[PDB]
Amino acid sequence: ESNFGVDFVIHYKVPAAERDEAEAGFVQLIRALTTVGLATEVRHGENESLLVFVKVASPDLFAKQVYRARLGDWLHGVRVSAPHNDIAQALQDEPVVEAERLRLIYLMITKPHNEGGAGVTPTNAKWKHVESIFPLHSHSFNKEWIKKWSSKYTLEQTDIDNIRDKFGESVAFYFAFLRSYFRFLVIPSAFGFGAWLLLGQFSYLYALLCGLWSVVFFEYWKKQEVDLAVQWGVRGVSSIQQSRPEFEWEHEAEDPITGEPVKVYPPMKRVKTQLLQIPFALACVVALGALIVTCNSLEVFINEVYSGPGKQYLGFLPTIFLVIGTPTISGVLMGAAEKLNAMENYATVDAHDAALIQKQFVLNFMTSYMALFFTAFVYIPFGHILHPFLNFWRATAQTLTFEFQINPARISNQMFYFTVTAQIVNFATEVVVPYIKQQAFQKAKEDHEEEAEFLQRVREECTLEEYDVSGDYREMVMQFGYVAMFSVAWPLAACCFLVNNWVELRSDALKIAISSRRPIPWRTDSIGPWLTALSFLSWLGSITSSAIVYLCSNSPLKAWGLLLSILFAEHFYLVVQLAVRFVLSKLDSPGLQKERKERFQTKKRLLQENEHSEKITREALEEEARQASIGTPEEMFWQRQRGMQETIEIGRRMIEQQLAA
Amino acid sequence: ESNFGVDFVIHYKVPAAERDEAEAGFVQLIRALTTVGLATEVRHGENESLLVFVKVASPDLFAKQVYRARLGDWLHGVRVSAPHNDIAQALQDEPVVEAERLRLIYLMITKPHNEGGAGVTPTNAKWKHVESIFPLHSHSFNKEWIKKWSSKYTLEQTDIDNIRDKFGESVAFYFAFLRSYFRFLVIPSAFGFGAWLLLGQFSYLYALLCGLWSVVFFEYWKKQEVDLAVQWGVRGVSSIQQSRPEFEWEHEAEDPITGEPVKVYPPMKRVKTQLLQIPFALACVVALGALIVTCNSLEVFINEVYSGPGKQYLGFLPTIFLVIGTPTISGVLMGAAEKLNAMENYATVDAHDAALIQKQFVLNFMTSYMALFFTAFVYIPFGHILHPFLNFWRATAQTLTFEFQINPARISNQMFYFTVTAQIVNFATEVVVPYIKQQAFQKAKEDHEEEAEFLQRVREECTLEEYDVSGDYREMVMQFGYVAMFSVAWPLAACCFLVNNWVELRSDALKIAISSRRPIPWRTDSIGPWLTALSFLSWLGSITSSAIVYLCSNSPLKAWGLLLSILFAEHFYLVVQLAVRFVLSKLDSPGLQKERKERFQTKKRLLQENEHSEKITREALEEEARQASIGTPEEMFWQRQRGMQETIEIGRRMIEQQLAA
Ligand SMILES: [Ca+2]
Ligand SMILES: [Ca+2]
Ligand SMILES: [Ca+2]
Ligand SMILES: [Ca+2]
């Protein structure tokens, strides 16, 4: 139930084909680990691998490394004050959390020799046999965390702080984002319940309301994250650029700022494959669009022809099957997105991650909303254009066996089926399928007889995949997109997503608990490029919900109404965006006062670290001595009234002279 | 042609009604001036006033004050580095310009005793007889500056820097803004010339073009001003809050940041008179709107009735008279705006100035564009609603003497008459009327017989009004508004404004030269609240130019077209705003590199101001001695393979064992 003090575990798969070269890499690896002061320990890994175990046996060099990284943060404006202790007397002032300790150990194993480390990143260096470097998982904290999160109803800030001190900043930002989003989802849940009871289907007021809610939630989260970045001492980390190890280069050019020749790569070679996104984008758009329009034509052909013998529920069976098939096509889609992004040689890890978020968000946007767009914006306004598909299905099924009435409330049933089966498929794919996978490999399953269970748990933890938080961001961003631009089709969607988010805030916590190895703790200022995604989804929601409520509320479609509704709701979005930004500028979050007060008090301590007429007539006497040494008329003008009492009495007699005249 | 070294002149009007009290205030004034180390000198002022003259006779206390203000800038993040010289050996490192010197002297005469100064601001303190504190005007620089600006065609950056070193930062920001705006006006001048030749009246392409030009000009100026604020060492000054002297208060509450009890004022008392703007706003809107609709009805009645005996030029004579009357009504309008803003008790000078800019911009917006709005958006789409005014004028003029055909190209003639007579009225009111005023008071017009002409020039300089740069900002912002939202009515407006701006960049320079006393040099990071005005005017231009080109291009007015054109051009504005912001993020202005490079080099100098296996087995031996003193199984696990060569050979024999199995 407790580790052996091990901070990191390296896998180092030794295949039989390259045994001697992998042995030379092994001895070079453990040499390089011993140079940076890591006590090593070698144990057996299954299928010919060598689990080596590292730790800092030297607390003095560890505190020296901690002080060096704190100075590196202080140079880039991260820390408020310097450590001010080259000796370890600042560690008692500010302790090291487990996340900061594991991050600095990972930097000592990851950074190159110029940075003061033994860089053993797998693909770029010679270390092609280093499979995975990963920290361990403390089960005594894990079980307590899962139990205390399942027991409570709401989560305080101390729970997110306990996530911060043991899983880095990024996982804690995800849980803080999901907690704040779950708390803000109760407003359109209640208002959608009210609109589903009272206002009838497709109410305009709920469209304006969910637009306003998306604005206030996005701006409030953008305030709350800079508050959290002040509180965790991580504000401004995105200015620091981490050099990606797999970034190839050609030259080593002039110094930008520091004095160091940084390695460069010709950007036209980058744009040559940046433009590889565009034919891939158009190809994937038309492929998924042809699949979606084929599914839509098939379901309308089926519910026209069979006339619903069993149920009308059987009519949207192709839509249900398409949503079921959507995670499988999105798997190869994200694979071909990640391969394309990795081929696009990116300099720093921030830009590489941001481009991966952009490609993954575009592909998931298409495969999550193009069915509902073809339902709302194509099928409802003019649905006669898919009649060749209908007569094609008729001419095929007539040989195979040997009046359209486009319902405007088809989108409500479609959105209900979409939300429910997407909830079921997402819940099955997220936890239940890995639950039965780990229970299946549980029933399918020397070494010093005391450390046996420890090496058992490490050998089984090597097989798990590393937890990426990008996917759990993307799921919630898409759910927010459903809320922003399709809740007017089905106003109980916010209530369903509220229940899903309360289950999800424990479910994704369970995924980090037992279905994935502990992620390498990184620091981030924010959720990063997902803020652009939330902003774009809210802006598109203000257009789309209004056009949906006009086109489904529908008389012929008077296009004088549609453009006016789109214009009014989009300008209402812009006006409420200005209003909420102006209001949230005035709230005076306490972290800003704390940061600027500490900075001013430190520089005020530096400030404190750093008769009259006598002086005036003395300098006038000095200038008179310089005049008598020798330019002259201003000298006479200043030497008229030298003493101040002379000026007083001359001014008073001049008041008397001006009183005479 | 040269001063007597005088830095400041104080007027101190002594009326005969309060002669003894003003004399006591005089002796207290010159006492307080002598405490802060200012050599004083009293000369006669006309109509019973006492021009006292100050200077720093003590360069040591002046350099001490300079170092104190530089530390005050360094605490608030303005300066890159500290002065690092309590002795005056930093003044040789960075010299004092005349603007910084005069600003610090004005702070020594303006700041209270707690700040280390003798605060003699007129209305708040007892000094109700101090009329005006003002610096002098160096004519040898003035004549050279006017001559070298009239000789050149274009102005280099060195001219704006010579304005910066002698008139502060704010006047130099105005001249830099007018130079950059005059340089960017040549693009819609040439394109409007092309549209006026080729494309015919009311072209949509010119509307999209001037929208794009307004975007690129506004974003390029917003980049250029942070570049200039880096270069002049003034970046970040807007974070510093200057306490307004006339700000009344009730309490002196807790300390926000510094430690000082700041004085507070109940904000509900402020909102009580903030809401006095709204009935004043609605009253002024309906008053100017009734005047404009009366003028419009009168001119259409006149050109209907008389049928143009002389000319059609005589028909818009009421519009010409209304533009002529516009500076006179705007005078009392800005008076009642400034009185309302001064009644609204504002804490700091930044918020007070920003609210004055907001009120003045709203009133000048109405009186500059509501005539053209009632022409374009009311008279052209539906003009039958003003027929009661027409029959009213008929029923009056029928007793007084004893078919409408609304032309869509009426706005072109209106905009031409508006631009031309506004140019003529603005040029007459700006320079020519003060030119004949100063030549009229020239022909209408003891004391030691050597300083006679100096006291003559100071006595005549007291009568001039202090130059406010807000008015010369507001004129150009309104001209930019004409370009942004009405150039499609008359595409030569940009060419006319280009010629006007080339004349204006010397004319407003002449106004500071001889028609106004030298302004007290202030520091500002930017043009401030006018950036919101340019952004709002460009955004409204994207709507208004498109609606104008549809409604005047006009068939009946198909309102399916109007909303689509407004929507397309506004979203084109938003898309090109994103595009230009993304492009200008990548240009890498050199001032940012210079600032962050100097900051990193200073903190890197502070950074530089601040065997392996032996240590590893030594700490392992220490922990073994602690174990033998006595928790134990991890100790045994770490003490298995102590030395690194032991780990090497144990790992190699384990490779051999995994090779056996
Ligand atoms: Ca899930
Ligand atoms: Ca998830
Ligand atoms: Ca002018
Ligand atoms: Ca002007």
Counted residue by residue, chain A has a size of 661
- Nearest Cα of chain B lies from the Cα of A258 at a distance, in angstroms, of 7
CA atoms within 13 A on the CB side of A559: 9
User: What's the B433 CA to ligand 4 centre distance in angstroms?
Assistant: 14
Q: What's the burial of B114, exposed, middle or buried (CB within 10 Å: 0-12/13-18/19+)?
A: exposed
| DSSP 8-state code for residue B43 | E
- List, as ranges, residues 69-108 from A with C-beta within 8 Å of B: 71, 74-75, 86
Which of A59, A450, A604 comes nearest B633 by C-beta? A450
Residue with tokens 């930008």: A256
| Closest C-alpha to A489, from A562, A540, A546, A564 | A546
Amino acid at B321: F
- Interface test with chain B among A610, A614, A618, A659, by most B beta carbons within 10 Å: A610
Whether B472 has a binding-site annotation, put simply, is: yes
Taking CB atoms and an 8 Å limit, are A644 and B31 in contact across chains? yes
Which of A59, A648, A655 comes nearest B19 by C-beta? A655
User: Helix B410-427 crosses helix B469-486 at what angle (to 10 degrees)?
Assistant: 160
- According to DSSP, the residues that pair with B263 across neighbouring strands are B252
Contact B568, B208 (CB under 8 A): no
User: What's the B589 CA to ligand 4 centre distance in angstroms?
Assistant: 30
Cα–Cα distance for residue pair A502/A153, rounded to 1 Å: 9
Amino acid at B63: A
CA distances from A343 to A1, A283, B104 (A): 42, 19, 59
* Cα dihedral across residues A307, A308, A313, A319: positive or negative: negative
From chain A, the residues in CB contact with B656 under 8 A are none
Whether B341 has a binding-site annotation, put simply, is: no
- List, as ranges, residues 304-363 from A with C-beta within 8 Å of B: none
User: What's the A475 CA to ligand 2 centre distance in angstroms?
Assistant: 6
Cα–Cα distance for residue pair B484/B212, rounded to 1 Å: 10
N-to-C CA span, chain B: 103
**Cβ-based neighbour number of residue A134 at 10 Å:** 20
- According to DSSP, the residues that pair with B44 across neighbouring strands are B50
DSSP A32-61: HHHHTT-EEEEEEETTTEEEEEEE---HHH
Cα–Cα distance for residue pair B343/B352, rounded to 1 Å: 11
Q: What's the burial of A311, exposed, middle or buried (CB within 10 Å: 0-12/13-18/19+)?
A: exposed
Secondary structure percentages of chain A, helix, strand, coil, to 5:
70, 5, 25
Taking CB atoms and an 8 Å limit, are A619 and B644 in contact across chains? no
Chain B residue closest in CA terms to A22: B655
CA atoms within 13 A on the CB side of A627: 15
CA distances from B606 to A74, A562, B59, B601 (A): 11, 64, 32, 9
- List, as ranges, residues 609-648 from A with C-beta within 8 Å of B: 610, 612-613, 615-616, 619-620, 623, 633-634, 636-638, 640-641, 644, 647-648
The answer to whether B585 faces chain A, any CB pair under 8 Å, is no
Give the contacts of A333 (CB within 8 A, at least 6 positions apart).
Answer: A284, A363, A367
What b/e sequence results for B484-515 when a residue is b if at least 16 CB atoms lie within 10 Å of its CB, and e otherwise? bbbbbbbbbbbbbbbebbbebbebbbbbbbbb
Taking CB atoms and an 8 Å limit, are A44 and B600 in contact across chains? no
Instruction: Determine phi and psi for A314, rounding to 5 degrees.
Output: -70, -15
Give the contacts of A446 (CB within 8 A, at least 6 positions apart).
Answer: none
- Nearest Cα of chain A lies from the Cα of B438 at a distance, in angstroms, of 26
| Helix, strand or coil, per DSSP, at residue B517 | strand
Give the contacts of B70 (CB within 8 A, at least 6 positions apart).
Answer: B79, B83, B90
Chain B residue closest in CA terms to A649: B27
DSSP A359-372: HHHHHHHHHHHHHH
Contact B246, B255 (CB under 8 A): no
| Closest C-alpha to A241, from A231, A228, A252, A256 | A256
Contact B30, B52 (CB under 8 A): yes
Give the angle B634-B635-B638 at the CA atoms, nearest 5°: 85
Chain B residue closest in CA terms to A602: B75
| Closest C-alpha to A186, from A174, A176, A198, A194 | A194
The answer to whether A5 faces chain B, any CB pair under 8 Å, is yes
| Helix, strand or coil, per DSSP, at residue B438 | helix
Technique that determined the structure: cryo-EM
- What are the strands, taking DSSP E only, across A469-577? none
Residue with tokens 């404009």: B292
Helices (H), ranges, A306-432: 317-343, 349-373, 387-401, 410-427
User: What's the B507 CA to ligand 4 centre distance in angstroms?
Assistant: 8
Question: What ligand has the least distance to the C-alpha of A516?
Answer: 2
Whether B430 has a binding-site annotation, put simply, is: yes
Amino acid at B90: A
Contact A383, A404 (CB under 8 A): yes
From chain A, the residues in CB contact with B564 under 8 A are 563
Taking CB atoms and an 8 Å limit, are A71 and B610 in contact across chains? yes
Amino acid at A655: I
* Cα dihedral across residues A147, A151, A153, A159: positive or negative: negative
Taking CB atoms and an 8 Å limit, are B50 and A619 in contact across chains? no
Contact A344, A446 (CB under 8 A): no
Taking CB atoms and an 8 Å limit, are A4 and B634 in contact across chains? yes
Residue with tokens 């209004």: A546
Counted residue by residue, chain B has a size of 661
Cα–Cα distance for residue pair A221/A180, rounded to 1 Å: 7
DSSP A606-639: HHHH--HHHHHHHHHHHHHHHHHH--HHHHHHHS
**Cβ-based neighbour number of residue A85 at 10 Å:** 14
Helices (H) and strands (E) in chain B, counts: 24, 6
Cα–Cα distance for residue pair B72/B78, rounded to 1 Å: 9
Cα–Cα distance for residue pair B536/A223, rounded to 1 Å: 25
- According to DSSP, the residues that pair with B133 across neighbouring strands are B10
Taking CB atoms and an 8 Å limit, are A616 and B450 in contact across chains? no
Which of A560, A567, A616 comes nearest B560 by C-beta? A560
Whether A430 has a binding-site annotation, put simply, is: yes
**Residue A660: alpha-carbon gap to chain centroid:** 82
The alpha carbon torsion through A545, A548, A552, A558 (nearest 10 deg) reads 120
Contact B47, B462 (CB under 8 A): no
Q: Which two tokens stand for residue B360?
A: 């003045």
What b/e sequence results for B264-280 when a residue is b if at least 16 CB atoms lie within 10 Å of its CB, and e otherwise? eeeeeeeeeeeeebeee
Chain A residue closest in CA terms to B4: A634
Contact A184, A483 (CB under 8 A): no
User: What's the A420 CA to ligand 2 centre distance in angstroms?
Assistant: 16
| Closest C-alpha to B176, from B118, B222, B211, B243 | B222
- Nearest Cα of chain B lies from the Cα of A612 at a distance, in angstroms, of 6
Give the contacts of A592 (CB within 8 A, at least 6 positions apart).
Answer: A230
Q: Which two tokens stand for residue B465?
A: 């009004």
Chain B residue closest in CA terms to A650: B42
User: What's the B317 CA to ligand 3 centre distance in angstroms?
Assistant: 22
Cα–Cα distance for residue pair A76/B607, rounded to 1 Å: 12
Which of A41, A559, A641 comes nearest B640 by C-beta? A41
Cα–Cα distance for residue pair B280/B273, rounded to 1 Å: 11
| DSSP 8-state code for residue B314 | T
Cα–Cα distance for residue pair B626/A116, rounded to 1 Å: 31
Give the angle B432-B437-B438 at the CA atoms, nearest 5°: 100
Taking CB atoms and an 8 Å limit, are B58 and A615 in contact across chains? yes
Q: Which two tokens stand for residue B510?
A: 């002449």
Secondary structure percentages of chain B, helix, strand, coil, to 5:
70, 5, 25
Contact A175, A473 (CB under 8 A): no
Q: Which two tokens stand for residue B439?
A: 């030549």
Contact A55, A38 (CB under 8 A): yes
From chain A, the residues in CB contact with B600 under 8 A are 75, 257-258
User: What's the A520 CA to ligand 2 centre distance in angstroms?
Assistant: 18
The answer to whether A48 faces chain B, any CB pair under 8 Å, is yes
User: What's the B469 CA to ligand 4 centre distance in angstroms?
Assistant: 8
Give the contacts of A60 (CB within 8 A, at least 6 positions apart).
Answer: A88
- According to DSSP, the residues that pair with A251 across neighbouring strands are A264
Cα–Cα distance for residue pair B146/B138, rounded to 1 Å: 12
Q: Which two tokens stand for residue B143?
A: 């004549």
Cα–Cα distance for residue pair B431/B438, rounded to 1 Å: 10
Amino acid at A309: P
Which of A37, A610, A655 comes nearest B616 by C-beta? A37
Which of A5, A40, A647 comes nearest B647 by C-beta? A40
Cα–Cα distance for residue pair A70/B377, rounded to 1 Å: 62
| DSSP 8-state code for residue A95 | P
Q: Which two tokens stand for residue B351?
A: 């918020």
- What are the strands, taking DSSP E only, across A178-327? 251-252, 263-264
The answer to whether A14 faces chain B, any CB pair under 8 Å, is yes
Taking CB atoms and an 8 Å limit, are B619 and A57 in contact across chains? yes
Bridge-based pairing state of the strands B8-10 and A251-252: unpaired
CA distances from B325 to A631, B295, B368 (A): 53, 12, 12
Amino acid at A357: I
Q: Which two tokens stand for residue B79?
A: 């300066």
User: Helix A469-486 crosses helix A410-427 at what angle (to 10 degrees)?
Assistant: 160
Cα–Cα distance for residue pair B428/B437, rounded to 1 Å: 12
Instruction: Determine phi and psi for A479, rounding to 5 degrees.
Output: -65, -40
Cα–Cα distance for residue pair A576/B554, rounded to 1 Å: 33
Q: Which two tokens stand for residue A84?
A: 């001010």
Cα–Cα distance for residue pair A371/A292, rounded to 1 Å: 6
- Interface test with chain B among A35, A616, A657, by most B beta carbons within 10 Å: A616
What b/e sequence results for A382-421 when a residue is b if at least 16 CB atoms lie within 10 Å of its CB, and e otherwise? ebeebeebbeebeeeeeeeeeeeeeebebbbbbbbbbbeb
DSSP B122-155: TTTSS-TT---EEE---HHHHHHHHHHHHH-SS-
The answer to whether B582 faces chain A, any CB pair under 8 Å, is no
What b/e sequence results for B451-471 when a residue is b if at least 16 CB atoms lie within 10 Å of its CB, and e otherwise? beebbeebbebbebeebebbe
| DSSP 8-state code for residue A388 | H
DSSP B526-550: SSTTHHHHHHHHHHHHHHHHHHHHH
Q: Which two tokens stand for residue A401?
A: 């066996």
CA distances from A457 to A42, A442, A462, B255 (A): 15, 12, 9, 56
N-to-C CA span, chain A: 103
- According to DSSP, the residues that pair with B45 across neighbouring strands are B49
Helices (H) and strands (E) in chain A, counts: 24, 6
Cα–Cα distance for residue pair B110/B406, rounded to 1 Å: 61
A125 — alpha (psi -120 to 50), left (phi > 0) or beta? beta
